[PDB]
Amino acid sequence: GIVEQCCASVCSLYQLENYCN
Amino acid sequence: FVNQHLCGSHLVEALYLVCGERGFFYTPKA
Ligand SMILES: [Zn+2]
């Protein structure tokens, strides 16, 4: 999930965009 | 864009910014 990808680890902008509607 | 850990309200604010008119989903149990 997003917490594991972007908080516990680090997300690129592209990875953040996987959580857009 | 920053390259760092984004957590909690900071993660939500980043999604709000990045996603723009599309909107986003914040589902932290996922
Ligand atoms: Zn803070």
Tokens of A15: 């990875």
Could you tell me which chain B residue has the CA closest to the CA of A21? B24
Q: Cα(first)–Cα(last) distance of chain A, in Å?
A: 15
Q: CB–CB of B30 and A13 under 8 A?
A: no
* Resolution value, angstrom units: 1.3
CB pairs under 8 A between A and B: 54
The CB-side HSE value for A4 (13 A sphere, CA atoms) comes to 3
B28, A1 Cβ separation under 8 angstroms: yes
B28–chain A nearest CA distance, Å: 6
Strand partners, B24: A20
Helix (H) or strand (E) holding B3: none
SS3 string of chain B? CCCCCCCHHHHHHHHHHHHHHHCECCCCCC
A1, B29 Cβ separation under 8 angstroms: yes
Sign of the C-alpha dihedral computed for residues A2, A11, B18 and B9 taken in this order: positive
